């Protein structure tokens with residue numbers, strides 16, 4: 380077999396996506412940069428057999444469209460799959476939108492035409508996405524005229540969805556009703572695209588609720604309206620398209636290809652042109668995006684705290700066992716070995732892909748120490764860092780008026796999206812013995828710590 384770390388070295392962590400971590404990697408010979416998704420066999424089950432995954436990868440590697448992520452290679456070892464593809468540096472679609480002055484039906488139409496164009500093409504090759512959502516739409520580069528690239532086509536056919544709310548944040552808004560009941564086809568991608576279209580034009584989900592299951596109930600019933608005030612600013616042809624895409628019975632639902640010929644797409648994408656800014660839509664999208672990202676950061680922070688506890692004590696156990704004389708001390712070599720040992724047990728950390736990468740992390744930890752218990756504390760704080768800073772930056776972003784505080788109403792929203800229990804979070808707060816009806820960042824962080832057994 381060919382080995383992933385023989386070819387690629389990891390540069391830096393790009394983020395978390397469906398089914399695993401994504402690393403920026405570089406070919407050790409040619410210097411080609413690529414994005415690598417590392418899927419752990421221990422945390423993600425396969426729905427299909429080997430042969431079927433291989434033939435699907437062999438197909439994906441051959442496909443080519445300007446709105447679909449390019450896949451280059453695939454590797455597999457004892458514990459992991461590695462999907463190697465083209466790296467995109469423009470970030471998520473919605474983050475580019477919320478940093479705009481104007482946004483019109485014209486900008487929406489140009490977004491949606493690209494999305495429908497990639498989808499159309501993948502459906503002709505019998506590949507269905509199933510989990511189409513804003514996070515899966517990346518901008519190819521930081522440029523102004525950059526294409527949208529859809530990531531994760533085909534994956535959900537081969538790998539089972541996580542049940543953890545860490546991993547499901549914001550998926551219920553987009554999912555087709557028929558995917559909930561088991562019988563689904565390519566039309567599920569049109570539904571998801573109509574949900575995204577609805578949000579682009581109103582800033583709000585068509586099927587919404589106070590918690591994950593409430594949202595799913597709305598989706599299953601399938602009723603939505605155009606009753607919000609900002610829909611008055613919207614053409615009727617956009618409403619007609621949305622209706623066709625959010626048609627409940629999939630055989631009555633419009634195809635991706637047919638949707639590219641809809642009058643709204645034709646009208647509003649003319650290079651010619653022939654139109655107001657939907658400022659309310661943009662405000663709500665800015666609010667939506669901050670809420671989703673704060674809830675996502677809250678869960679990852681809590682998850683990272685539990686992992687940190689689990690690995691801190693295990694490393695301590697490994698190093699104690701390694702301590703042959705029992706004096707509490709170890710040299711550079713034992714530290715490396717013990718750290719490696721930790722990763723056989725707990726699986727490879729995305730950013731430690733080989734023995735060389737562990738050494739530099741050790742050597743980095745030592746540079747800040749220049750006694751195995753000081754090493755443990757420093758090495759673990761360095762794995763929490765990204766979580767603790769992501770949380771603070773996510774709290775700062777969500778606090779749009781810079782008041783330094785989040786109200787109880789906003790906590791409800793955040794904890795509902797995070798699917799944490801109304802009575803449970805209210806109880807943690809109380810342990811705010813003074814009821815301002817609001818919390819600053821330190822208090823919010825204490826709430827989360829208390830919701831994960833600290």
Ligand SMILES: CC(C)(C)n1nc(Oc2cccc(Cl)c2)c2c(N)ncnc21
Pocket residue numbers: 393394395396401414415416448462463464465466467468517530531
């Ligand atoms: C940063 C993240 C996790 C949203 N992401 N995901 C990406 O999607 C990937 C990246 C590698 C393999 C697969 Cl199957 C999907 C991605 C990319 N291609 N370029 C830059 N960032 C990427």
